[PDB]
Coordinates of C-alpha atoms and ligand atoms in Angstrom, one line a residue:
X1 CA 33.2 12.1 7.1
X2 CA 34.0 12.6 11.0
X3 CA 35.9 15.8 10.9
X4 CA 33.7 17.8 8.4
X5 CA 32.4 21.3 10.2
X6 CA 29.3 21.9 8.0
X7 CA 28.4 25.8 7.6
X8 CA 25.5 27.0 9.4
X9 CA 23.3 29.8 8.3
X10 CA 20.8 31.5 10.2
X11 CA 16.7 30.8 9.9
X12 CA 13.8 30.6 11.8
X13 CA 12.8 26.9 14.0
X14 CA 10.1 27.6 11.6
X15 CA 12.4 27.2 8.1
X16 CA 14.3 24.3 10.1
X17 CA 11.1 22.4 10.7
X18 CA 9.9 23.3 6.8
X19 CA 13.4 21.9 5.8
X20 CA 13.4 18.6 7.4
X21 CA 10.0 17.7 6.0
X22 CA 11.2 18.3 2.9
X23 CA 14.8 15.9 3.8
X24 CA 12.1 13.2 4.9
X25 CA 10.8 12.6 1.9
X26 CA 13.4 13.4 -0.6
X27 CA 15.7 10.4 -1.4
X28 CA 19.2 12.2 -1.3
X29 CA 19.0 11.8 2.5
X30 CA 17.2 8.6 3.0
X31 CA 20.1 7.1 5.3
X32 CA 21.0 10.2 7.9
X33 CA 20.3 9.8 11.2
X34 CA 18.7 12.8 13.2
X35 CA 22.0 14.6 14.0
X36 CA 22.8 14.7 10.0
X37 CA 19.9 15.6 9.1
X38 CA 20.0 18.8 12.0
X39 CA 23.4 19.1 10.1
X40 CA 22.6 19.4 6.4
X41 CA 19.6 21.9 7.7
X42 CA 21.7 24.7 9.1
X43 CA 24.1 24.1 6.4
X44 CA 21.0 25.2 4.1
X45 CA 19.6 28.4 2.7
X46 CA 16.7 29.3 0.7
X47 CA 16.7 31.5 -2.5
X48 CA 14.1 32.4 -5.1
X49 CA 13.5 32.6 -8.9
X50 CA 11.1 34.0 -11.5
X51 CA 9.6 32.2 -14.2
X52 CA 11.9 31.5 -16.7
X53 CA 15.0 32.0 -14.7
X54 CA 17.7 28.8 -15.2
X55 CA 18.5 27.6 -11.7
X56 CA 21.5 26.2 -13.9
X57 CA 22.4 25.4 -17.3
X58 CA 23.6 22.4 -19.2
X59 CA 27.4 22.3 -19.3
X60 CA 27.9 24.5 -16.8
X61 CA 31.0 23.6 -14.5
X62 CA 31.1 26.3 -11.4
X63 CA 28.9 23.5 -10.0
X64 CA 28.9 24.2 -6.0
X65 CA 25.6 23.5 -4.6
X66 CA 22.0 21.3 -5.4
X67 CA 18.6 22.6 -4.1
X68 CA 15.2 21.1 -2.9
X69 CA 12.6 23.0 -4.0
X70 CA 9.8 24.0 -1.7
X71 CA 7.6 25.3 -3.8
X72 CA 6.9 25.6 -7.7
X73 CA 8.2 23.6 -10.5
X74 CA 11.1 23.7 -13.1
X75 CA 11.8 22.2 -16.5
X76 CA 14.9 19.9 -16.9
X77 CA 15.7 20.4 -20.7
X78 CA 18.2 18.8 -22.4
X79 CA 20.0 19.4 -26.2
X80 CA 16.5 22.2 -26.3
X81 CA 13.9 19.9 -25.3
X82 CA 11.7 19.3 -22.0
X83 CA 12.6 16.5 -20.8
X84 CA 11.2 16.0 -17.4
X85 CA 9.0 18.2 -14.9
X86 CA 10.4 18.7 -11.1
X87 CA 8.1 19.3 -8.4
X88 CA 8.3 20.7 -4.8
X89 CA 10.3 18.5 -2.5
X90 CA 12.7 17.0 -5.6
X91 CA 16.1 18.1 -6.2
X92 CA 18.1 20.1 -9.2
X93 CA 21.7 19.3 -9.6
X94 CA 22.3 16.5 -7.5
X95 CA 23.9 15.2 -10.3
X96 CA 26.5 17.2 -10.8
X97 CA 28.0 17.5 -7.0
X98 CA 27.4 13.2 -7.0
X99 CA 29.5 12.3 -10.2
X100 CA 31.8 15.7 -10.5
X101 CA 30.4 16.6 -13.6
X102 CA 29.2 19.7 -15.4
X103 CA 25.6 20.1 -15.3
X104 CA 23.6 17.5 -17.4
X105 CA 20.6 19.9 -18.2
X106 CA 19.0 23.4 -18.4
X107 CA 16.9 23.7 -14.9
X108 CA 14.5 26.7 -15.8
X109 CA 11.5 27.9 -13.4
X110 CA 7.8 27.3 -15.3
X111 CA 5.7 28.7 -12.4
X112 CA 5.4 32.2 -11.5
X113 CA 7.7 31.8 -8.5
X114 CA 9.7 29.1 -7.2
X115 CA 11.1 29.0 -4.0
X116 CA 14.3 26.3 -3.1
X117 CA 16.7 25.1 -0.3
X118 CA 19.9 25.4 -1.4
X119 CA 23.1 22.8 -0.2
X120 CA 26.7 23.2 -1.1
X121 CA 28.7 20.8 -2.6
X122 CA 31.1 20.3 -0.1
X123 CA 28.3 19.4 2.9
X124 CA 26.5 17.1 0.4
X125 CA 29.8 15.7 -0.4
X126 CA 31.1 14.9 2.8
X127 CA 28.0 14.7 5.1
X128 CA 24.8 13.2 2.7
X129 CA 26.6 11.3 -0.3
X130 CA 27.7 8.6 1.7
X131 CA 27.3 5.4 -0.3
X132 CA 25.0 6.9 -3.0
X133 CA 27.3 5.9 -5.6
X134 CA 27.5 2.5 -5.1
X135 CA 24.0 2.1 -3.7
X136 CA 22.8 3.3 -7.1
X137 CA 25.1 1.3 -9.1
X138 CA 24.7 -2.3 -7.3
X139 CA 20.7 -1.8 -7.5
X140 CA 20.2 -0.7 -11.2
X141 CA 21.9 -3.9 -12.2
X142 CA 18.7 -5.7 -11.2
X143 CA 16.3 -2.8 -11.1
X144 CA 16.6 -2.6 -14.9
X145 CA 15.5 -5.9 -14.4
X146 CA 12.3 -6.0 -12.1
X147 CA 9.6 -6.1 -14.3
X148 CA 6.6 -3.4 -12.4
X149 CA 9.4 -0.8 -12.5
X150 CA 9.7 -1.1 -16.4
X151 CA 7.3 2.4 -16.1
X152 CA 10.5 4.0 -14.5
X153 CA 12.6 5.9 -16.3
X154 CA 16.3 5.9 -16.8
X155 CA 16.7 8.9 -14.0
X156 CA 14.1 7.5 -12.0
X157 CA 15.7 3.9 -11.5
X158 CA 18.5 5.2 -10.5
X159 CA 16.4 8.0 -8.0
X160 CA 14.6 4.5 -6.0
X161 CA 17.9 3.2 -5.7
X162 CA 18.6 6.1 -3.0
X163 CA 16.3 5.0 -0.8
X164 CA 16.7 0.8 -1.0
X165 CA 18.1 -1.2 1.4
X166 CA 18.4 -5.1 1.3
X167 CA 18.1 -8.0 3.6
X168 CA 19.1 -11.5 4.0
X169 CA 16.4 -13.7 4.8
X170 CA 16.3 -17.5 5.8
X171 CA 13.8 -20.1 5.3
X172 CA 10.9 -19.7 7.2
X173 CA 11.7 -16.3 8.2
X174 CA 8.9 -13.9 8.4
X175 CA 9.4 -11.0 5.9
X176 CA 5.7 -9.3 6.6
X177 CA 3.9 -10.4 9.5
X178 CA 0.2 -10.5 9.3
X179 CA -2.1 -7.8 11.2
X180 CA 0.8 -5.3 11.7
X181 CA 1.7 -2.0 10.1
X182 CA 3.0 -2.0 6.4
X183 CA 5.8 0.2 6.3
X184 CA 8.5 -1.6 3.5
X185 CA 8.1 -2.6 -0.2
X186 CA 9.9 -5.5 -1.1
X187 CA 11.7 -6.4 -4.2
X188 CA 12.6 -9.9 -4.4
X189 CA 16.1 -10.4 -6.0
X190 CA 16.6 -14.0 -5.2
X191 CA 14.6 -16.6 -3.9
X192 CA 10.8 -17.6 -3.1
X193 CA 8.7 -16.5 -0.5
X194 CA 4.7 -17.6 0.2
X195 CA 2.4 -15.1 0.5
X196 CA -0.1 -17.0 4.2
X197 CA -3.5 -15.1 4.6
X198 CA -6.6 -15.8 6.6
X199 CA -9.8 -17.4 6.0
X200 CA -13.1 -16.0 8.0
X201 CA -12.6 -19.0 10.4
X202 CA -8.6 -17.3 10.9
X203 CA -7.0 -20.1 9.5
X204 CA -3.9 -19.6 7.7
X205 CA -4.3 -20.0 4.0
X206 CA -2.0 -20.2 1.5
X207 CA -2.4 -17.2 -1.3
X208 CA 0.5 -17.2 -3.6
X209 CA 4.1 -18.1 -4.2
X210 CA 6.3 -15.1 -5.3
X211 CA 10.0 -15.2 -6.8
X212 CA 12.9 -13.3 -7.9
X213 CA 12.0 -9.7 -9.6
X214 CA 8.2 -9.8 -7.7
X215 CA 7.5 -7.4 -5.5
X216 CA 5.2 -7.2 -1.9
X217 CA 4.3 -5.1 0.9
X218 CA 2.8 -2.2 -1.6
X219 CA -1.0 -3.5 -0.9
X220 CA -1.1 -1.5 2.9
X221 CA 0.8 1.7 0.8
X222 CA -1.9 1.7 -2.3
X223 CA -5.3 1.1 0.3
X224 CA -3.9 2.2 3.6
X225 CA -4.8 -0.7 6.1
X226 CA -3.4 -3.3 8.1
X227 CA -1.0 -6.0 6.3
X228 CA -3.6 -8.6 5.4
X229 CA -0.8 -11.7 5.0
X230 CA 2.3 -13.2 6.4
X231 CA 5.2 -13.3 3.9
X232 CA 7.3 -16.2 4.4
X233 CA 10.8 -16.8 2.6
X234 CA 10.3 -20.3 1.4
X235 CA 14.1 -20.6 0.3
X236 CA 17.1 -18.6 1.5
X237 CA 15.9 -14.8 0.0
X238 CA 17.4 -11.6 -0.6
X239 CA 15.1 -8.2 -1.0
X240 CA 15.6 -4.4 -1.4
X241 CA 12.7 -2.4 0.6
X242 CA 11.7 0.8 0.2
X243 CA 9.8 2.7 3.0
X244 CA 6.3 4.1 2.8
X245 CA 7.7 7.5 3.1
X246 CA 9.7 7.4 -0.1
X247 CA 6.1 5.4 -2.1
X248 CA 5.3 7.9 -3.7
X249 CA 8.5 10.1 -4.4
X250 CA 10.1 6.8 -5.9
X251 CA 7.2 5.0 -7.6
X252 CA 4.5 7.7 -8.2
X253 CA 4.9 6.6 -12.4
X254 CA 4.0 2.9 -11.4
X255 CA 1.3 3.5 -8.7
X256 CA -1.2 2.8 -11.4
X257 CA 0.6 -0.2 -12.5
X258 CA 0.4 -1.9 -9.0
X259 CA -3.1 -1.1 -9.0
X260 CA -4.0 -2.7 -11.9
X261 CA -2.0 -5.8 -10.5
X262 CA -3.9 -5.8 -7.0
X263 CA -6.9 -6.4 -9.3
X264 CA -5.4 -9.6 -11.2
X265 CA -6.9 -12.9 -10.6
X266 CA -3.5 -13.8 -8.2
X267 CA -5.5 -11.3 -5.7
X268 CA -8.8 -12.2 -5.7
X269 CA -7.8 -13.7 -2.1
X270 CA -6.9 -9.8 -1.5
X271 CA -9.9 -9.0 -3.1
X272 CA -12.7 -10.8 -0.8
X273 CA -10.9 -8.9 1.8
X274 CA -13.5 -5.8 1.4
Ligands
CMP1 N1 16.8 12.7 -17.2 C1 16.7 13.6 -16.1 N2 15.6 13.4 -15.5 C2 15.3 14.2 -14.4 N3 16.2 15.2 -14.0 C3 17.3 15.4 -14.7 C4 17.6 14.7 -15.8 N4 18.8 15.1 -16.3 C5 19.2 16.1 -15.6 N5 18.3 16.3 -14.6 C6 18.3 17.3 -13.5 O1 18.9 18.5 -14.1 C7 20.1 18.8 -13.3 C8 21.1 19.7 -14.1 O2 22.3 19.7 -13.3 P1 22.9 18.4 -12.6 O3 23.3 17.6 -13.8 O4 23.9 18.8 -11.4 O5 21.6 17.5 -11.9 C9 20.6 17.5 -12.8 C10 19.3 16.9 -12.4 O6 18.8 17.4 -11.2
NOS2 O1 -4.4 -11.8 -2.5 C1 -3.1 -11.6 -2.6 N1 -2.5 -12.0 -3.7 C2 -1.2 -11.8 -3.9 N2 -0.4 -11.2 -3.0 C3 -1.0 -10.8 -1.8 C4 -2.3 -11.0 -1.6 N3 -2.7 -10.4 -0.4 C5 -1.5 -9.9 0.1 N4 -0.5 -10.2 -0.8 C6 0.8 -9.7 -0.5 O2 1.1 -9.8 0.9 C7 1.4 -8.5 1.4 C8 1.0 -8.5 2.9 O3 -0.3 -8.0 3.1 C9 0.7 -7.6 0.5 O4 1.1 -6.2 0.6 C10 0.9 -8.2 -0.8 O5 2.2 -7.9 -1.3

């Protein structure tokens, strides 16, 4: 990991600048630090395909490099059927250069054009994997489990597990402060935690008690304000956050499902707040 010289292939401060957008919001690189993610840029390259063209095919095992796409979409088709639509700023054949496998699926372009960063296996290997693998498998235990992301398929569970990190918390620590920035979604995988509003007056109020498999912070993501509660860990607690940059890559599917919960009658504190 330390000794790895990563390629570098030539492009404009412009393509550089386009690239690390893209790395910002894609999960594969949630965890790099500014000098990685310089790194995996210059050891990028764009290409281009036609509609129709397969970016890859299922079984395939020359298997040397994934891409995020910058613009247009591609099918992911498996044993002849569609399976799942990819969008600009996801990636094709991450899987493959993660678990050493041949591909898993037909990749095929369904817009005109489709334009894509390209990354070789050997830079993703040694410079983005990281802890990928067992990042994804310690959270998909519980994910599985956590009831709003039941709308999430298979490939997608294992997709917010990229971008999760978890925290100890003690009682009486404060998780989510009132009146400050929301900028992590919780997922509660043990313990309680109290969810401390405020009256007009500004008196603290208590709002709501939360457990294991509940989720908060995702109120400021949805309506784009100011966190309206404290959230205290009532017991000794342990989370998995997710930033706001990665909301909608990660949980786009169940967006309409936290909605719909913000409107229960557990928020009608939340409610009164407009
Ligand atoms: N269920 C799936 N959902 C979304 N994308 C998939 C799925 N299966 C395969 N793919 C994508 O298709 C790619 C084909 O090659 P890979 O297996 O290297 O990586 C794969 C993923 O990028
Ligand atoms: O009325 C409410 N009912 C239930 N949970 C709430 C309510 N208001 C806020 N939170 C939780 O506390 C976080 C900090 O603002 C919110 O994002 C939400 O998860």
């Amino acid at each position: 990991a330390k000794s790895y010289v990563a390629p570098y292939f030539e492009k404009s401060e412009d393509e550089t600048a386009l690239i690390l957008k893209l790395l910002t919001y894609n999960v594969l690189f949630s965890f790099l630090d500014s000098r990685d993610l310089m790194t995996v840029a210059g050891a990028m390259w764009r290409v281009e395909f036609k509609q129709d063209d397969c970016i890859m095919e299922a079984g395939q095992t020359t298997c040397d490099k994934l891409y995020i796409i910058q613009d247009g979409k591609a099918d992911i088709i498996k044993e002849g059927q569609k399976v799942y639509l990819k969008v600009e700023g996801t990636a094709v054949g991450e899987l493959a250069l993660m678990y050493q496998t041949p591909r898993a699926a037909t990749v095929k372009v369904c817009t005109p054009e489709l334009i894509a960063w390209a990354l070789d296996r050997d830079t993703y290997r040694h410079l983005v994997m990281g802890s990928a693998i067992r990042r994804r498998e310690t959270y998909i235990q519980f994910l599985t489990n956590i009831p709003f992301l039941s709308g999430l398929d298979n490939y997608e569970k294992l997709q917010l597990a990229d971008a999760l990190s978890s925290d100890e918390f003690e009682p009486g620590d404060y998780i989510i402060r009132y009146g400050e920035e929301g900028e992590w979604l919780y997922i509660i995988l043990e313990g309680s935690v109290d969810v401390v509003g405020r009256d007009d007056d500004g008196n603290e109020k208590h709002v709501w008690e939360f457990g294991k498999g509940d989720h908060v912070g995702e109120l400021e993501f949805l309506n784009n304000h100011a966190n309206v509660a404290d959230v205290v860990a009532k017991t000794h607690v342990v989370t998995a956050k997710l930033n706001r940059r990665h909301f909608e890559m990660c949980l786009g599917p169940v967006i309409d499902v936290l909605k719909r919960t913000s409107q229960q009658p557990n928020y009608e504190y939340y409610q009164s707040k407009l």
